[PDB]
Design a binder for this molecule. Structure first.
Ligand SMILES: O=P(O)(O)OCCCc1c[nH]c2ccccc12
Ligand SMILES: O=P(O)(O)OCCCc1c[nH]c2ccccc12
Ligand SMILES: *Cc1c(COP(=O)(O)O)cnc(C)c1O
Ligand SMILES: *Cc1c(COP(=O)(O)O)cnc(C)c1O
Ligand code: NA
Ligand code: NA
Lengths: 390, 265, 390, 265
């Protein structure tokens, strides 16, 4: 029994062991109550404004579009405290944990940004944070691991299975299965069992709300399309949400194409996977013919969730949103182009969204189009990766 | 078929509880796993609970995580598990055989097809660890259409509505959790009131599981009103400890199962 | 002859070779004209808002001050595009270069932040940028050097003298001495020959203007003191300027004490140097008894300017501002404390200002005081340094 | 004293321009530098321009940057430079000696004291490279009080007001820049109109400097109306090239200075 619908069409649900159902129901109830509580809303708004730096800028990129009929704006989540949009929702989830009387936080992380975000929120709000991270990721993300520890969080390497994000997801749920009375599981994307896809969207929806107000102020009309990368789905659903009912606005999600869809080395389950049940939800998955879950591959370590949020699978199914992919090389070219022409170093994740907008522009340069790319994070973290490739 | 019903009736006639070991099919290899299973049966197992290696066993602690890893290292697939199940049933006609599955493996290529394959090889029940009663409709319906008992877990704190649903939805046996958390012999888990409410609602006989690793826990479960007990991690550890000595592995499995079964009398 | 006063009391001036006087006079005239031009002001404001992210937040730090009568706010220049306050003034200087018809930019850098800031501004505004950096700094700042190159700037190592910041300062002036007709010298701090100390202050003064409005909104009164680190003097004068005439507001500048003033291994020329003439100005300098210029030492590579802006020397002389020092160990402790208690990783430069506020608080915990620390930059860049020390 | 006035009068009586080499005092060591200087004089130098090693010579290109580095490697200090200057004057009573200084070295321990020390050792002029006319008051006043000529640079494009100030403020000689930039023999720099305006305003005789490295440039400067030419980087390169052969260094310095001085006739 739930207060809200756990499904988006066929996708979603609450596929967790029975022992975890009370925790999900408690979380859903706390969330519905918080959404109607003006005190919770004001506290969240105050943290977003005065701690995290909202609203974030909406930057026009004239140098990149010169000579074409494309007008391109970047929603600057790269300027949010922490350097990525993840900060928005961890603040909200930390306030939910405190509303329920929880004192501890559990979080999973792949490349480490969600771990850092969870740790900073926990440090600010007096919560004891523990983060699960696949051992292969721990080895490749020393900087983020050190940040988490500076911020007082415990980082626990996970060596089971592939020792990467999905394995950390499993371990977080294993721990929660025994610790839910005292700990809240701060899931890092708009995926997992209900109510997570819903909560994460609502705690990221200010991205699209601000973008709408900003583009109306600057252009007097809505965008032709808003474009966002899709790892698990949080930055994209945060950008898309406020525009879902604006039927003229295209919603374009960009999954990582890795070395190319035909190689099988990609992270594009929405368009190139098969529906399965894993991580508490029914959604398109990267999986073997037999049903074993596989990893997503991308040059961008943050586009590693091996499935996708259920709301995206649903929006695709009804034709409201369109999903495409961008390869490692396309993303790298977009990264270089933004650095050189706008003086902004984008995260490689976000570079996937930018790359698709660049293709929209370049393929039809005399098409009049007003586009917004969600620049989900800054790319300082990726300079070593890019340097080594070049 | 009615293998669980026949077993529990026989056990009740003997005032005995059921002792049900759990192992991962194919750990540490197909041949050794078939030998392990025959040894568990010869040593006194009343029924079997058998896992199919899955990439992400989120209800399992390290011991069973590592059994899954060993099986995968030996290339074990669900198809090979079903070939094993057919052979096990061909040797042992009456022992109840229950599978411990993760949802993706059941849903993957069709829920109905999965339950039909179980029926074909002679499996008696399926417990899908990550399908709560709330999401269980298609699974339980398919199980029933193919004469498979769908097994549901009762948390060590389930409220009345949940007890009524578990009693109504399940068949064969009711899985009674000893505690929160995940599988593991290192963490030991009063279940009398849950046991009584289940009997009141005419639920399938309860088998207590999680943390059962000693004879006195088998006797305690039965004294509390459960029909028996399941032990997995304690069994799996014997496999893990004796990988280099297959013979000693079988001897130690035999000794442990014999001691656990004796405590059910 | 000048339009504006080149001196702050005894300090300042225009001590450059005669050949460079016309360039300084031209720059001063262009600046005076730009300051009265509503179009220039609007263009600068638009870049600050929509590209760089102003206004920056003013964050209250309740966890750090718990149990004391100190209320501490952080002015969040760490959230500015680029991660430090340097971005403000390079945007303004790039607009001045374009106003004068210049197409090229020269800039010096020590630790690299000014080089990155100059490069991003140049990339955005269509200027060809070349950056001089001491070879010892180039070797220790690979990340920043790569950023500059991604942004299209030319990085030129300087091997003369000590191969560090002062040497890069000399080389920038050597180049300008031959290229002023086409290039503008984008000096990186509120120091050097007039009109630089003045221009840099005016192009950083929004820090203090915003802080004043923010603290009035949140507390209904002005701070008891505003505290800022002092390398060359730009972030501090940007914070101080709007409060100079508010006599009740203390202005506290914090120079690096390095291993301790008594060791001589520090970067605190204002309070522990001797007045000299170098880098085009008369100001307190780190120098030998014979008059040879020496380097400043600090755990923080960005507090390396071996002198200090003339306006600070002046404000000190009249008693309007007070200058103190903070050692490497004090700065490190402040860095750790902010990470752990507020989830903010501060630049080691800025950590010097924070450390002094912490001492103000801790030495007199029942003193009622409302303090603002200028958090001049983020400390992601310093995590390796800190990790290695710990 | 009036050493520049006496020199220029003598040169004018002979219809000759002045050839004035520049070297960094103490490069590559005190003893070798004293030998280099005596060789420049013996080879025909009419006057000397001498730099005091400074940490940050921002008006100098690489050649003189490296001369400063060599002198510092030999531990040369301003105090040792003044001991050298006294010895040079003791050997050579009439040659005009001009210093090329950076402001901090003059201001450091007192402007007046610096000019008094120059007077004591017998220096005739001081050119402070980074003190423009606009900041020159205390320097020029102190120079004049101690019978030192303050030298000012006239840019290759100076306007009328600047020409008038340079003419009024300077003494001894007027330094005429061949071009923008910094010292260097690799970059060669019409100065006739500036030369005429200086004569109109009764400025001290002009010595052209920057990039002078060949005899034909000496003759050209003089033909243009300058009283002579200063050559630094070309001289310093001879030191740099012959560090390992002190004797060859002196021979090559002699040959170069002789050729440059001959072109002034
Ligand atoms: O003895 P233990 O603690 O290993 O429990 C073993 C119970 C059978 C079992 C194995 N894996 C599972 C996942 C979910 C529910 C039950 C199981
Ligand atoms: O022959 P060049 O080009 O080395 O010029 C040498 C002129 C004397 C000289 C040496 N260093 C200086 C700094 C400023 C002005 C003049 C000088
Ligand atoms: C984590 C991350 C993503 C991907 O996660 P989503 O949930 O799909 O948004 C994208 N961009 C950045 C900068 C990220 O840190
Ligand atoms: C460069 C820098 C400084 C020091 O320079 P100032 O001109 O003294 O402000 C301080 N903080 C940060 C973050 C810097 O990047
Ligand atoms: Na994905
Ligand atoms: Na300084």
């Amino acid at each position: 029994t739930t207060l809200l619908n756990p499904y988006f069409g066929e996708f979603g649900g609450m596929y967790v062991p029975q022992i975890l159902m009370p925790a999900l129901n408690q979380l859903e109830e706390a969330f519905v109550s918080a959404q109607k509580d003006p005190e919770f809303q004001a506290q969240f708004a105050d943290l977003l404004k005065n701690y995290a730096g909202r609203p974030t800028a909406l930057t026009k990129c004239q140098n990149i579009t010169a000579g074409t009929r494309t007008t391109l704006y970047l929603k600057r989540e790269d300027l949010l405290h922490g350097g990525a949009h993840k900060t928005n929702q961890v603040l909200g989830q930390a306030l939910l944990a405190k509303r329920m009387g929880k004192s501890e936080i559990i979080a999973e992380t792949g490349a480490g940004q969600h771990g850092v975000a969870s740790a900073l929120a926990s440090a600010l709000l007096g919560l004891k944070c523990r983060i699960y991270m696949g051992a292969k990721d721990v080895e490749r993300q020393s900087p983020n691991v050190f940040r988490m520890r500076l911020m007082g969080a415990e980082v626990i390497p996970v060596h089971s299975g592939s020792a990467t994000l999905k394995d950390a997801c499993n371990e977080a749920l294993r721990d929660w299965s025994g610790s839910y009375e005292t700990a809240h599981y701060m899931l890092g994307t708009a995926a997992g069992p209900h109510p997570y896809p819903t909560i994460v969207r609502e705690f990221q929806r200010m991205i699209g709300e601000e973008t709408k107000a900003q583009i109306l102020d600057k252009e007097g009309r809505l965008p032709d399309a808003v474009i966002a990368c899709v790892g698990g789905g949080s930055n994209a659903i945060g950008m898309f949400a406020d525009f879902i009912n604006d039927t003229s606005v295209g919603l374009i999600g960009v999954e990582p194409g890795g070395h190319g869809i035909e190689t099988g080395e990609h992270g594009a389950p929405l368009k190139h996977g098969r529906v399965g049940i894993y991580f508490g939800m029914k959604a398109p998955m990267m999986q073997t013919a037999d049903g074993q879950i596989e990893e997503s591959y991308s040059i961008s370590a943050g586009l590693d969730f091996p499935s996708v949020g259920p709301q995206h699978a649903y929006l695709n199914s009804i034709g409201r949103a369109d999903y495409v992919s961008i390869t490692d090389d396309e993303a790298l070219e977009a990264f270089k182009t933004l650095c050189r022409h706008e003086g902004i170093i984008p995260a490689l994740e976000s570079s996937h969204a930018l790359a698709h907008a660049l293709k929209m522009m370049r393929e039809q340069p005399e098409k009049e189009q007003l586009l917004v790319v969600n620049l989900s994070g800054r790319g300082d973290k990726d300079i070593f990766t890019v340097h080594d490739i070049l | 078929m009615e293998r669980y019903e026949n077993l529990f009736a026989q056990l009740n006639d003997r005032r005995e509880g059921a002792f049900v070991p759990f192992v991962t099919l194919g750990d540490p290899g197909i041949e050794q796993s078939l030998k392990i299973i025959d040894t568990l049966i010869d040593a006194g197992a009343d029924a079997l609970e058998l896992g199919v290696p899955f990439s992400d066993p989120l209800a399992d602690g390290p011991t069973i995580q590592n059994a899954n890893l060993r099986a995968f290292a030996a290339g074990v697939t669900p198809a090979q598990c079903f070939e094993m199940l057919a052979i096990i049933r061909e040797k042992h006609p009456t022992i109840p055989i229950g599978l411990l599955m993760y949802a993706n493996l059941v849903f993957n290529n069709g829920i109905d097809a999965f339950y039909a394959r179980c029926e074909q090889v002679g499996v008696d029940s399926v417990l899908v660890a990550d399908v709560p009663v709330e999401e269980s409709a298609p699974f339980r319906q398919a199980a029933l259409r193919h004469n498979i008992a769908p097994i549901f877990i009762c948390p060590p704190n389930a409220d009345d509505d949940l007890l009524r649903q578990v009693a109504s939805y399940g068949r064969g046996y009711t899985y009674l959790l000893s505690r929160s958390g995940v599988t593991g012999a290192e963490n030991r888990g009063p279940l009398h009131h849950l046991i009584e409410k289940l009997k009141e609602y005419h639920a399938a006989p309860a088998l207590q599981g999680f943390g059962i690793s000693s004879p006195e826990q088998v006797s305690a479960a039965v004294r509390a009103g459960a029909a028996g007990a399941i032990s997995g991690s304690a069994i799996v550890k014997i496999i893990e400890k004796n990988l280099a000595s297959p013979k000693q592995m079988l001897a130690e499995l035999r000794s442990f199962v014999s001691a656990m079964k004796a405590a059910s009398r």
